[PDB]
Amino acid sequence: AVVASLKPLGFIASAIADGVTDTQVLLPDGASEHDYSLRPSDVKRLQGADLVVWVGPEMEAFMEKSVRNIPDNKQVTIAQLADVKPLLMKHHHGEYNMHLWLSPEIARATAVAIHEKLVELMPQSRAKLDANLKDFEAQLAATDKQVGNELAPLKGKGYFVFHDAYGYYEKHYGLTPLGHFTVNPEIQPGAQRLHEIRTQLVEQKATCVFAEPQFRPAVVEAVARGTSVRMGTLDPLGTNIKLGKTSYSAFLSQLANQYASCLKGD
Numbered sequence: 001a002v003v004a005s006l007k008p009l010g011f012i013a014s015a016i017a018d019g020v021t022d023t024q025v026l027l028p029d030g031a032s033e034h035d036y037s038l039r040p041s042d043v044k045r046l047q048g049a050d051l052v053v054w055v056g057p058e059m060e061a062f063m064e065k066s067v068r069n070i071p072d073n074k075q076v077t078i079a080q081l082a083d084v085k086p087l088l089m090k091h092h093h094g095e096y097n098m099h100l101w102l103s104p105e106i107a108r109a110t111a112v113a114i115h116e117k118l119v120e121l122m123p124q125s126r127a128k129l130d131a132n133l134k135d136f137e138a139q140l141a142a143t144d145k146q147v148g149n150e151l152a153p154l155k156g157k158g159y160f161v162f163h164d165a166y167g168y169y170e171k172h173y174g175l176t177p178l179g180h181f182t183v184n185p186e187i188q189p190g191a192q193r194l195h196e197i198r199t200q201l202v203e204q205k206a207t208c209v210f211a212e213p214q215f216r217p218a219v220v221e222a223v224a225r226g227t228s229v230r231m232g233t234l235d236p237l238g239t240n241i242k243l244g245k246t247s248y249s250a251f252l253s254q255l256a257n258q259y260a261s262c263l264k265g266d
């Protein structure tokens, strides 16, 4: 099996590995990067993998140690790929945005790297692997066209998010975020912080404020209350999407729908 650290990396790997080997996701969606410690059973899975796919030590810091013993020809470390360097832009404490799965261009380079490793590891399946890469790139191009068109009429509409993640996706499709607020998903900001957030919401003319699935509706409402800003939800992990050949294209389209759902009209 190919073992991917995070679900959207699973989406990409499952496009390339389809009909060749299973794709597995290491961690449940609810986990994170610095508090999370790997179970010995997780380490075993990594070492048993045909191929490990992860962003790298600036993102899944918790697995850097586990991945040292795995040979280079059995891992794709996305942040360290040669073709990914010119695609990086300025796990949140590092210098670069490491939410790399949100860049269609980085997804493409990831798929190429996965394909290349798999062909070396499983040359008996080269043709199927070539076919899978061909199909992934064709879907990505088609999705890219479709999403770009869905999001084009939304240009210029401002919004805030509770997570500085989406820059790769927003720059690529020409969305115009105003900025981000650090908000605890379980606990609303204090009186002073909330005042400052709410005034920026109105002052900067935001159409929407976007939360994520793990935010308690109460804290989102507390942020949006009084302002005339519509509330939205973005899911940067596509938690509801199953692994499979078409999953990464489905993820990019679902994210567009989530943006559009709050942003369009008014």
Ligand SMILES: O=C(NO)c1cn(Cc2ccccc2Cl)cc1-c1ccccc1
Binding pocket: 006, 029, 030, 031, 032, 033, 091, 092, 099, 163, 165, 212, 213, 214, 235, 236, 237, 238, 239
């Ligand atoms: O980037 C982030 N935090 O700053 C994330 C945001 N999420 C969204 C999320 C968290 C918990 C449960 C569901 C979801 Cl969609 C997941 C991560 C995340 C997951 C694994 C590793 C690092 C981050």
Ligand SMILES: [Zn+2]
Binding pocket: 091, 092, 099, 163, 164, 165
């Ligand atoms: Zn993040």
